[PDB]
């Protein structure tokens, strides 16, 4: 045994493209002393190669390792193994096999050949490239599996489950098929022992799975499908049931009867369900842990009988029509409540004082997007050891000041006060929050200067001050925050030059200064920021010239930490001259689009077009370039250096309405990603470089009001653009303009 053991191990070691792979593996050594190898009584019962980039084929594995007598388990997870399953010799001693997160390819039918392992119970093939070409006939012919995970594969077909269970589900305790495309009907009724089912993220347009008696089933996930029909009567046969995720489906009607005895997790979320929360649900109060009804037509108020449930950890009412006052009496009857999301409802009224208690309990309080009115509670966080993490109040009718009692919440990682009528100044005491990550105050009546003490927050990531009345210049202390990936200050009265210390931030993705009084020269130190893909400078007093070294960081840019945040891009149409710049990028998390009319007073933009929404998604993980540049409407002067063309990922460039004088560089032709370009109203002269005909991405351009002369390039997209954009260029000729 041991001789052929080590010899098989080494014979496998010989097939690895990386000669140094297994450090402790060699002849003349006890195999049981090897890394990732667990040996019992000088007989090998285990091998763990997981998370080791072997870069080898499966064929090499089946012959050498799987032929080991007495080997119970082999974990190949994330080992970079390619190829397909073939007929081989397998010991009956084998128990568990993990092939997950690998490159295995070909038809799923090959798995039928795993029957060579007589004692095989546990099999994880999840996250492979395996598929199922064409028809499904015969069966998997493995009935011995207590656990089967097919998740995250390329399989596309119908009733594949029947092909899996063809040999019977009798011994199967676990099934996960998820992350695939599968349709048809699901019959588990022959499997009485199945405790776990994940079919989620699939193609089923048909009825719900047939559960039969559903005696032993503790887990049902049908989510991520087109499913419709009656699931109540189907699961009515299930006495013991814990987790049910039906979310993201076509289910309709009122909430039907359910097996609430053993129920722990329940999600009806993201469906067409109507009506309000039923009474009988209280029957689950001895059990239920957390609940998600989000994304439905539900309205009304929360049943107070839920006070019988002390075990509710999380309550999500979000994205519904709900209104009314706050059942603080019922909510205080829930001891285990942590995250409360009321967001996107019609709830109204002022804030009950008793709320001051919840600061010592709730992890997350989201009241955002409601009809709420009244002041912010100054008595908040009076209780010792405040446990609050995330507070989202945005989009309400809240009035009054911002009490600096909020510093008494020391666990707060997120504060969103935005989209409100709040008055007063910004308390320097907020600097006393070391754990705060996202601070978004934008769209308020806030006045007064910016606290220097904010320098005391090193963990600051996102700061949204946009659309306020704030005055004064920028505190140098902000430089001490190295973790800021987002800086947006817009439509404010802030003045003064632009800090030169911005280069100190390697983590900063986005800088928006738009609509302000800032002056001075654009710092070349911007070229030291490697995270920065977005800059909107448009309406300001900046004088001076434009440095060419600002683009030196392009090509090394890493936007990784920037992703995952909700955004809105409001495109400026050139119809109204009072709305300036290419567009406005603002942080939209927890806010309704329908309330954007609150900007009517703060901005001159309507006629019903046009809004862009989404989540932050840079076009590159690393080594990219600046995606957005708007300097339009400024005093900037001089000539543009050749470096302007070093950013191939740049989508939009607006230098418009400036004093810029010189010749358009041929390097402009090097931008393949530029959709919209406004150079309008400048002193730029010379000929349009023929190289600009290399730009195929432009859907919009404005060259008007320049000193440019010569023929318009005929090729490229220039022919698509209207002469309206080419006006006030005396020496300029050629189509679309008149022929020379």
């Amino acid at each position: 045994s041991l001789y052929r053991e080590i010899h098989q191990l080494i014979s496998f070691k010989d097939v690895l493209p990386d000669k140094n792979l297994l450090p402790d593996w060699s002849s003349n050594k006890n195999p049981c002393t090897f890394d990732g190898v667990t040996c019992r009584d000088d007989k090998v019962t285990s091998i763990d190669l997981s998370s080791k980039p072997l870069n080898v084929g499966f064929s090499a594995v089946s012959s050498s390792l799987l032929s080991l007598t007495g080997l119970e388990s082999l974990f190949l997870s994330n080992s970079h193994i390619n190829g397909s399953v073939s007929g081989f010799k397998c010991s009956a001693s084998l128990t568990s096999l993990d092939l997950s997160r690998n490159s295995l390819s070909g038809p799923v039918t090959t798995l039928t050949s795993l029957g060579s392992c007589s004692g095989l119970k546990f099999l994880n093939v999840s996250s492979n490239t395996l598929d199922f070409p064409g028809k499904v006939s015969g069966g998997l012919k493995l009935n011995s599996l207590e656990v089967l995970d097919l998740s995250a594969n390329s399989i596309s077909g119908a009733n594949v489950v029947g092909w899996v269970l063809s040999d019977g589900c009798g011994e199967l305790k676990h099934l996960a098929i998820s992350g695939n495309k599968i349709s048809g009907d699901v019959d588990v009724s022959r499997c009485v022992n199945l405790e776990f089912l994940d079919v989620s993220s699939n193609n089923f347009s048909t009825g719900i799975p047939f559960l039969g008696d559903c005696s032993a089933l503790q887990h049902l996930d049908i989510s991520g499908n087109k499913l419709s029909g009656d699931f109540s009567r189907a699961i009515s046969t299930c006495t013991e049931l814990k987790l049910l995720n039906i979310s993201s489906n076509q289910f309709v009607g009122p909430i039907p009867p359910l097996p609430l005895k053993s129920l722990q997790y329940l999600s009806l979320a993201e469906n067409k369900f109507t009506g309000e929360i039923p009474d009988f649900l209280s029957g689950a109060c001895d059990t239920l842990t957390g609940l998600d009804l989000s994304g439905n037509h539900f309205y009304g108020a929360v049943p107070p009988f839920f006070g019988s449930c002390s075990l509710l950890e999380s309550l999500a009412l979000s994205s519904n029509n709900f209104s009314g006052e706050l059942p603080m009496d019922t909510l205080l009857k829930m001891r285990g409540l942590k995250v409360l999301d009321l967001s996107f409802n019609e709830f109204s009224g002022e804030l009950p004082e008793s709320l001051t208690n919840l600061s010592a309990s709730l992890l997350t309080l989201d009241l955002s997007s409601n009809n709420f009115s009244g002041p912010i509670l100054p008595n908040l966080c009076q209780n010792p050891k405040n446990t609050l993490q995330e507070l989202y109040l945005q989009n309400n009718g809240f009035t009054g000041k911002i009490p600096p009692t909020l510093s008494n919440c020391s666990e707060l990682v997120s504060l969103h006060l935005s989209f409100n009528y709040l008055s007063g100044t910004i308390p320097s005491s907020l600097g006393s929050l070391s754990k705060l990550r996202d601070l978004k105050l934008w769209l308020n009546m806030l006045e007064g200067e910016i606290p220097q003490e904010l320098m005391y927050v090193k963990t600051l990531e996102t700061l949204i001050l946009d659309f306020n009345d704030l005055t004064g210049e920028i505190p140098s202390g902000l430089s001490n925050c190295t973790n800021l990936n987002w800086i947006s200050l817009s439509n404010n009265r802030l003045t003064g030059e632009i800090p030169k210390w911005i280069g100190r931030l390697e983590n900063l993705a986005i800088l928006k200064l738009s609509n302000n009084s800032f002056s001075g020269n654009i710092p070349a130190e911007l070229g030291d920021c490697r995270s920065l893909i977005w800059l909107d400078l448009n309406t300001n007093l900046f004088n001076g010239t434009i440095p060419a070294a600002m683009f030196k960081q392009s090509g090394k840019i890493a936007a990784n930490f920037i992703a995952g945040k909700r955004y809105v891009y409001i495109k400026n149409d050139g119809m109204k001259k009072e709305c300036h710049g290419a567009g406005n990028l603002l942080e939209f998390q927890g806010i309704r689009s329908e309330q954007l009319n609150r900007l009517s007073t703060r901005n001159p933009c309507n006629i019903t077009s046009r809004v862009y929404e989404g989540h932050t998604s840079p076009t590159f993980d690393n080594n990219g370039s600046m995606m957005f540049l708007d300097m339009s409407y400024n005093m900037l002067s001089g000539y543009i250096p050749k470096e302007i063309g070093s950013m191939p990922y740049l989508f939009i460039l607006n230098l418009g309405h400036n004093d810029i004088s010189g010749s358009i560089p041929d390097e402009v032709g090097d931008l393949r990603g530029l959709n919209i370009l406004d150079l309008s109203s400048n002193k730029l002269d010379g000929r349009i470089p023929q190289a600009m005909s290399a730009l195929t991405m432009l859907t919009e351009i404005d060259l008007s009001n320049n000193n440019l002369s010569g023929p318009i390039p005929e090729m490229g997209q220039f022919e698509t653009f209207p002469p309206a954009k080419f006006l006030n260029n005396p020496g300029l000729c050629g189509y679309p303009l008149p022929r020379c």
Partner: protein, 185 residues
């Protein structure tokens, strides 16, 4: 979102390595918020510019269901397949540029049903067959480049075609008429 469904079918049939069609969501109220797609004040699509997106595959007939569609620029791609015979269902299309592609098949007859057509540039393609005489009934024709193609037959000197010069019809397989420099038998 009929327009959105149609354009989505187009996306499905298309091959998109750079994922420029990734922004297109069928669940959306309309296509108007998609990249490279432009809609009017009536919230109907007047424009689609996919030009030089490095795309493969072939097109879909559902394009013909866009009534207010104006500009279509598909140019500079590997795209293959025939030009849809029902494209004549587009009344308002003022510009069609398919040039620099693998496009095949005869020039569709129903194109004669485009009254407002201004730009048609097919140059550097694989198209064959005769040049439809119904195109002469299009009086709005301004710029046309058929050069470097496989097109064959006689070239009409009447209608709007009188506006054009041999360089547009140049480098073809066999073309005859007063318009070409090669005579008809």
């Amino acid at each position: 979102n009929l327009e959105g469904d149609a354009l989505h079918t187009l996306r499905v049939t298309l091959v998109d390595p750079n994922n420029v069609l990734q922004s297109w969501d069928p669940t959306l109220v309309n296509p108007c918020t998609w990249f490279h797609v432009t809609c009017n004040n009536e919230n109907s699509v007047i424009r689609v510019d996919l030009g030089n997106a490095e795309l493969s595959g072939h097109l879909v007939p559902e394009l013909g269901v866009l009534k207010n569609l104006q500009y279509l620029e598909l140019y500079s791609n590997n795209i293959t397949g025939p030009i849809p015979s029902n494209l004549g269902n587009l009344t308002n299309l003022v510009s069609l540029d398919l040039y620099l592609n693998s496009f095949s098949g005869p020039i569709p007859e129903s194109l004669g049903k485009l009254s407002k057509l201004r730009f048609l540039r097919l140059n550097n393609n694989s198209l064959t067959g005769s040049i439809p005489m119904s195109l002469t009934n299009i009086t709005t024709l301004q710029v046309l480049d058929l050069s470097n193609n496989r097109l064959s037959g006689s070239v009409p000197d009447n209608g709007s075609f009188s506006l054009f010069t041999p360089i547009s019809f140049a480098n073809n397989l066999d073309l005859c008429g007063p318009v070409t420099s090669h005579p008809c038998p």
